[model samples]
Target: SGFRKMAFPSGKVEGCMVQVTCGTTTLNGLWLDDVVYCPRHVICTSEDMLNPNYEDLLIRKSNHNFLVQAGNVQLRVIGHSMQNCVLKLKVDTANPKTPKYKFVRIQPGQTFSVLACYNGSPSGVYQCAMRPNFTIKGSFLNGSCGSVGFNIDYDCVSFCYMHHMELPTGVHAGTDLEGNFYGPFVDRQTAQAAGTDTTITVNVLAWLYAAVINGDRWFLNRFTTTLNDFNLVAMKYNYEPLTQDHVDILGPLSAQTGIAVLDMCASLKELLQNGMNGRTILGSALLEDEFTPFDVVRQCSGVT
Candidate 1:
C-alpha cells in the first residue's frame, strides 16, 4: 500500500525530464531502440541568437552526429538537462590522449559557446575550448527528456584553394575582412565587373575561380553553389585531391584548413590539364549546364 513509483515513471530522470516513452515492453522492463525512438523526436524549430558574424544551428540528441562548419561555431543542445560538456573528445583506444576538448555546460534551457579562434587564442570570451578539428563520429542518445536539436554559431573563414603551380601571374589579390591580401587568385565578380572574361588575359581557370572571391561565407554559397551534383547532410553547406579517406580526415577541418575546389564542369580533368595558365576556352560544354542526376555526375563532383 505504501509503494512509491519508480524513478523513471516519476518523470525526472537525470538527462530526460518529460516522459515520452517508446519501445515494446517485455516482462523485464521498457527498452529504448534509438532508431525508432530517435527519428520520431525529429521535428520542431530551434531559436536563434542574432550575431551576423557567427553561424548557428540547433542540435538535439535526435540529430545524432554530423559534420559542422569550421571556425567559431556555437551549438545549442536542446531538451536535455546536460550537466557537463555535451561531448567528449573521442578517445583513441590504441593511444588515447587526455581529453582537452570537453565542452562547457548549458544545463537545460540555456545557451553557450562551444569553441572559437580569435584574440590570438583558441578560446572566445566564453572560454570555449580549443581544437584543431571539430567532428563527431558518434551520436547522442534520446531519452525523451527534451526535443532534439543543436543551435551552432561559427565564424566561417573565407578560405581559398588556389593551385600553387597553376596560379596565373598578373591576377591581383582580394582582401580579407581583417585586411589580409588573400590572393594572387582571380575574383569572379571583380573579373566580371572589369569585363575580363577572356581567361587568356585574366590568366586563370574560368570555372574554379568562380564564386565569392571576396568574403567568408558558407562553402555551399561561396564555392560549390554554382556547380551541380553534390551531397551534404542536414546542411547542404559545404574539399580536396579529395579521396574518401581524405574526406574522412578533412570532413570536419575543411573550414579550418581552407578548402581546395575542383570545378567539376565537363570533368575537372582538363582544368588540371592545359596549364591553369588558362589555355582552355570557355567554349564547348565547359560553361554549359550539365545533367543533374546519376552517380556519375556525383562521382566527378567528389561524391562517394
Candidate 2:
C-alpha cells in the first residue's frame, strides 16, 4: 500500500503536498510528497518505488515519529504529533532571552518531526519543547535524537619546520640599488664577506636605535620582520623567543604618546616585515657621507 491515496476528513485527498522536515539540528527545508498511506509505516527512496510489504529495510516510522539511522550523525524524532487546525512548533524554550524556535504548519493527521542539536557529550542538559501556539502549554518531548561519540589515537594534524636564524644572504647594510651609501657603511660584498651573523651586532641595533630616535616607522616595521625571522630560528630548537601576544601589544601605536618607543618600533617592525625594508629618501640623504653614530642619533631625535 505505497503512495495509496490518503483520505482526510474533508474527503479523498489523493495528491496533496505535505510538509516534511528533513534535518537533525539545522532545519533544511520542507520536503513535499503526494499524500500516501502505508500499512506498516515505512518511508522510502521514493513513494512510487514502494512495495508495501517490501519493507524499506532502511528505516521505520512507527506512529508518526521515525529515526534516521545512517551517516556519522543519527537524527531521531522524539515527538511526532498532528493538529487538525493550523499550528506551529516552538523549539528551544529553555532560554529566557532570544529563544530559538521554528514554526511548523501542521495539517490534520499530517506528521511533523522536531529535531535537536547533538550536544557533543552524552552528559549535560538537553530539553526540547513543542507548543502549538508557541506558548508554554506545559507539553514537551524527550529522547536521544541519538548520541555522537568517536575515539582515536596518534594523529599529527599539524607540524612545523625550524632552522637557525642567519643574516639574509646577498643582502647587507650599505648603498642603495643606485650604488649610493648615505653613510660610512660597507658595501654588500664587504658586509656579507665578514662571515659573521651581523643580524644582531649590526642589523638589529642599527635599525631599532634609528627607529626609536627618529620615530622612523619604516625602520621599525623592518625591524619587526627581522625579529620574526630571529624568533623563527629560536623556535626551530623548541624556544619561543617571541610570542603572538608580544607582537600584538607593540605592533600598533601613534606617535607623541608617552608610550615606550619600543612599542612603536615593534609596530613598525611588523609592517616593515610585511612590506619592503629600506631607509626613506630623507634618511638616506642624511647618511650620504660619514654616517657616524652621532648622525644616527641626531637624525632620530625629537619626534612629535
Candidate 3:
C-alpha cells in the first residue's frame, strides 16, 4: 500500500544525519511523498565572517544533475542563521554549459516550492542546485546518504525563498523597526507627550500621502522610547510582483540567498481611498467617545 520504510545507507561521510522518511499517502497512493533536505548553507551561521557586505561577495554552485522531467523540486533555508549571504536556485540540464532555468534569488532559508512539469519521457532532465553567496565555502549537501525513491525518478516539489532586500537609507524619522516608510513621523517631543498624538500623526501623514501620491509608497517615523528612540517606517504597495508572477525560476532559490519578502505591504491603500487614514476618522469606527481613545483630546482641550 505504501513505502514501508525509507532507508539510507548508514556508512557515509557527513551524509548520515540528513535523511527523511516517507510515510503513507492517500492522494499520491504512496507515502514519503515529501522529503525535506535542510540545506547546509543555512545551518552554518558563519556567513558574516565569510562576507561582510551582502553584495561585495559572490555565491556559486557547481555540481548539477537532471531531476527527471516528470516531477517537482522543493528546497528550504533560513536567513537569521547567517549574516551576509543569500540563496539562489539555478535550473539547467547536466550539460556543463547551457542551463535552461535561469537563476533567481530567494528568501534566506525560506522554504521554496517548485513544480517543474516533466510531461513525456524525452523532455530532457530538469536539474537545480542552490547557491549561497557568502564569504566562505558553505557546504550544501555534505554527504550522499540521502535517498532517491519514488518509482518516478522526477521530483514533485522544490521549495525555496530568495533573500529579502533590506536597504539602509542612513537615518530618518517616523518609521517602524524594519525601516521602510516615513510619515506617522514622531519626534521625542510629540511622541513622549503621548495621548494618541503619535498614533494620530502616523495615521494623518499616511492618509495625506496616500490621498496625494499614487504608486509604491513608503513613510519614515522616528520617536523617543524608553530603550531606544531611533526607528524607521516602511511599507510596500502591491506585494511580490517578481516572485508571484515569475514563480517557476524563484521556487528553489532559497537557502542560497537572503530573506526574500514576497509579501511586503507598501502604502496603506485602505487609508485615503477608504477614508480610514486620519486619527479621528479611525477613532469614530473603534471608540464610543473621544475621551477614552484620545485622553488628551478631553483633558488638555477641556472638552466634557
Candidate 4:
C-alpha cells in the first residue's frame, strides 16, 4: 500500500488491561523482562527492573500496514498465556480520530496476523474489548515450581516501569527505536505492503519494557545518563557534529528513526541526565536542537 494518511487516539481510551504476574524463576517472568546491554549508561539502568536480566512474560506481534508520508498505520495484537489476551490491530497516526478500522480473535493453535494497506483511517485511537487466554503446562501450574500464575502475570508487564527513576519522567526516553528492537525489516516499504498481512504484535521484550518503564518515572531517570554517555561516544566515533548527525545514529540504532525532533530531544534529555555518570556532559560541545525526525524518514524511508 502506498502512503495514505491515518490517525489514532492519543489519550486514555476504553480497553481492558490484562496483566500477567509471574515469578522471577518462572519461564514467563524470564520471557517478559527488559535488560540493558549497556550497563554503564544512565538510561540503561533507568528502572532496576530494566536490568539486562529481568524477565518479560507478555507476548505480542505487529506489522507495518501503511506508508503515507503524512500518516502511517501499523497493527498490533497483545496477549498473555492461555487465559488473558487482547487482539487490537489498528492504523496508528498522530491525529488518532479517523475510523474505518479492523480487529479479530485468536483460537487455540491459531495464528494472529496484520494486513497493512493504503488509503485507510485518517487518524485516531481505536480500542476494543478482547483479551488472550493461555494455559500453563507441566506440574508448575500446581506449585511444582512455586507460583507460576503470579510469575507469568508479573513478568508480562507494560512500559510503566520507567517511573521508578529518580526524577520527573515522561514517555519520550522510553520510546526506543522500534527497528532497534525488531531489527532492519520494519522499514516503510515493509510497513506499507498489502501482501504482507502477517500477524505479529509488539515484541514481548518491547511491550513489557514499555509497561515496566511506564510504571516508574524514576526508572528512566536512572538510565538517562548512560544513554547520553553512549550517545556522545557514538557522536565522537561517527565524527558527525552533535546535531542532526546524532539523529542518524540514534534513529536506526533504536528503531525510533521517524520520531519527531522534539520527541528525540525529550527522550535524550532523560537519557543524558541519567546517563552522565561516567562521562562528562556534552556541555558546550553538545549539538544544538536544530535536528528533527525529518531526516529519519528521508534517510531511512525505502531503498534510497
Give TM per candidate. Answer: 0.15, 0.19, 0.17, 0.17
For residue 215, model 2's alpha carbon misses the true position, in angstroms, by 6.6
For residue 101, model 2's alpha carbon misses the true position, in angstroms, by: 87
Question: Model 1: runs farther than 4 Å from truth?
Answer: 1-266, 278-304
Decoy 4 TM-score against native: 0.17
lDDT of 1: 0.20
* Candidate 4 C-alpha lDDT tens digits along 1-304: 1221111122111111111112211111111111111101111122433333222222221222211121222222232112111112222322233212211222211111111111221122211111111111111111111111110111231221010111111111110111021111111111211121211111111221222222422222222233355446435433222344434434442454233333433444454345534432212123222112222233234312
Global lDDT of each model?
0.20, 0.25, 0.20, 0.21
Model 3's alpha-carbon lDDT is 0.20
lDDT of 2: 0.25
lDDT of 1 by residue, 278-301 (tens): 332332323211111111122223
Best by TM-score: 2
- Put the candidates in TM-score order, highest first: 2, 3, 4, 1
Error of 3 at 80 (Å): 21
Instruction: List clash counts for every candidate, in order.
Output: 24, 12, 71, 122
Best by lDDT: 2
